[PDB]
Every structure is written in C-alpha cells, then in structure tokens.
Design a protein around this ligand. Structure first.
Ligand SMILES: *CCC(=O)Nc1cccc(-n2c(-c3nc(-c4cnn(C5CCN(C)CC5)c4)cnc3N)nc3ccccc32)c1
Length: 269
C-alpha cells in the first residue's frame, strides 16, 4: 500500500504507544477506494517496535474467518493495514444492544471465539490478551479476534513461553511465573465467557469483581486464585456455561480443557 494513497478518513482508537485509523485506499485518486483499518505507533521505545514487527508477521500468517484479515503494510513509519469492521469491539457492542441479544447469541459468539482460538493453537500461537474488548464484530452474526499486539508464538519444541517483557485475564502460572501457553488462553477464555454472559456489564465486570474480593494487586490476585477463589456465576448464566468456565479456571493447566474440547460442548447447548 502506497502511503500517499492511504487517504485518511477518521481515527477509531487511541492507545498508550500507538493508535488505529480509518482510511480509504483510493489508488486511482477518485474517492472510490476500499475501507481499511490502519495501525501505527506514535511515541514508542524500541521495545514496542520489535513487538509491532511480530504482530505484522503473526497476523499475516493467520487465515481464519474468526481473526481480523491482514491486508498489507505501508512505508516499509511502518503502518499495518487490516480490514475494517464497522460494528466495533464486542465489549461495547454487548453493552449497547443488550436487549436484542440472548443466550443463543452469546453461545454463538463463544463458539466463534473458541474456533478462532483453536486455530491459533494449531499455529502454536498464544494471544496473551484475550478479552471481550479484543473481539470485534463483523455483523450481528459474526465476531473476529483482534489485537495480536501481545501475541507470541511457542518455541518450536515447547508448549509454553516464559515472558520477561491485562491482569484480571491472566492465569496463576502467568501471574506467578509469567508463563504463557495455549492452556493459559483457555483461562483467559473462561473470563471472556464471564464477560459475554454479563453482557460486559461494568458494575460486575471482571475488574470490579476481583477488586471487590480484596499491598499490590498481582500478589493479592495470585493468592485469591491459589486459595480457590473464582469469579461469581453471572446472574442468569446457564449451568453448562458456568461449569465450562470453572473447568477453564482449573489451577493446573494440564487439567484445563482444550478449545478442541470446548467447542463441541458450547455448540450442543
Ligand atoms: C472495545 C475496545 C475498543 O475500543 N477497541 C478498538 C478500538 C479501535 C480500533 C480497534 N482495532 C481494530 C479495528 N477497529 C474497528 C472499529 C473501532 N470502532 N469502530 C466503530 C466505529 C463507528 N462507531 C459508531 C462504533 C465503533 C470500528 C474496526 N476495524 C478494526 N480492524 N483493529 C485493531 C487491531 C489491533 C488493535 C486494535 C484494533 C479496536
């Protein structure tokens, strides 16, 4: 993509180090292009540049109807071009349209994220940042997984990555030892199920609820969880959905289900 032809339209979100923009790719120069989401880093230390170059590679190598489709890059500051999903992130989506959405639909959105994550597993990829806010809505019927800004691939003959270089979605062994894995994303998925069936309600949000249950955070959370404390059953959440969450939140990652194992259970409800 030629920088000069990525004609700016509007800004969609603004982060700590980097922000995303809405653009139209009009190479013919006649206001008739294709609408893409473009991502840059503004003020960013070398640590954040190395990360952005992986995202571009990881995201490029993924081909799944439940992950944001990479389109290309620009100038190489390097800009990452992706498809535009105008319904915006699921967290804010479930809030707005809470009335119209029912359990059946939340199951559907679960199924799709499950399948999505599963695919990441097959690629030996750990999202490390899986939550309702990092889901996006294509349509009422379709959601895609997003922000691979903290995604890391597994070392070629290992099931886990110890990261040296967010908190309420982590697993104990990620809180305690900064160990990350497929099996840790299953934990995180347990949390997104909570988020889904609370319609991401701010009041009983994962953040609020763990704060209401308890000196710093990481260590107070790691202790709570180690002691067996988990997030509450959401108001009207069905029994099977609540059970799948508990299984997702198992202390030992080897005992947590796989997305391969999760999918069929969610789909048969
Ligand atoms: C709920 C959290 C949140 O705000 N997330 C978020 C904001 C901005 C950009 C991304 N993001 C994209 C991406 N975003 C959109 C998008 C964002 N907002 N909209 C709608 C605009 C119109 N209004 C009325 C409703 C909201 C659309 C569309 N397409 C994409 N690709 N992509 C990435 C990739 C990495 C990080 C963040 C991304 C998310």
């Amino acid at each position: 993509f030629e920088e000069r032809h990525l004609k700016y339209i509007s800004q969609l979100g603004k982060g700590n180090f980097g922000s995303v923009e809405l653009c139209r790719y009009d190479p013919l120069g006649d206001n008739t292009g294709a609408l893409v989401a473009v991502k840059q880093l503004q003020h960013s230390g070398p640590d954040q540049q190395r990360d952005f170059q992986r995202e571009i590679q990881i995201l490029k190598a993924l081909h799944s109807d439940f992950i944001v489709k990479y389109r290309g890059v620009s100038y190489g500051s390097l800009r990452l071009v992706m498809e535009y999903l105008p319904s915006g992130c699921l967290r804010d989506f479930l809030q707005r349209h809470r009335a119209r959405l029912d359990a059946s639909r939340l199951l559907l959105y679960s199924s799709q994220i499950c399948k999505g994550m599963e695919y990441l597993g097959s690629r030996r990829c750990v999202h490390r940042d899986l939550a309702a806010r990092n889901i996006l809505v294509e349509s009422e019927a379709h959601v895609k997984i997003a922000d691979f800004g903290l995604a890391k691939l597994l070392p070629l003959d290992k099931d886990y990555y110890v990261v040296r270089e967010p908190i309420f979605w982590y697993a104990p062994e990620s809180l305690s030892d900064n160990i990350f894995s497929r099996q840790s994303d299953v934990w995180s998925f347990g949390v997104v199920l909570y988020e889904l069936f609370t319609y991401c309600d701010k009041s009983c949000s994962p953040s609020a609820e763990f704060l209401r249950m308890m000196v710093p955070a990481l260590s107070r959370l790691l202790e709570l969880l180690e002691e067996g404390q988990r997030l509450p059953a959401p108001p009207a959440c069905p029994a099977e959905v609540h059970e799948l969450m508990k299984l997702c939140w198992a202390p030992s990652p080897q005992d947590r289900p796989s997305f391969s194992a999760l999918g069929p259970q969610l789909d048969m409800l």
